[PDB]
Amino acid sequence: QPLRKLCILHRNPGRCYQKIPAFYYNQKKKQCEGFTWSGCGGNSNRFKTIEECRRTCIRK
């Protein structure tokens, strides 16, 4: 399901020690900016590669 609301919640790292740096869709720009994930908190919008982010958040 391309362009899902899960990509609209911005980065969701949570309060849990800092551990999985990745990317999130920057709805200021138009692409996946980088962010730092934590460990056990927040929704999702966790995208490893920028393409992979735009495939689901910006459409394939």
Domain ranges of the chain: 1-60
Separation between Cα atoms, residue 8 and residue 50, nearest integer Å: 15
- Give the helix ranges, DSSP H, for 3-60: 50-54
* Residue labelled with tokens 């992979």: 52
Separation between Cα atoms, residue 19 and residue 60, nearest integer Å: 29
Of 57, 60, 59, 2, nearest to 25 by C-alpha is 57
- DSSP-based three-state secondary structure for 22: strand
Of 42, 40, 15, 39, nearest to 24 by C-alpha is 42
What homologous superfamily is domain 1-60 in, according to CATH? Pancreatic trypsin inhibitor Kunitz domain (4.10.410.10)
- The experimental method is NMR
Cβ proximity of 22 and 11 under 8 Å: no
- How many CB atoms are located within 10 Å of the residue 14 CB? 13
Residues of the chain with a following break (C to N over 2.5 Å) = none
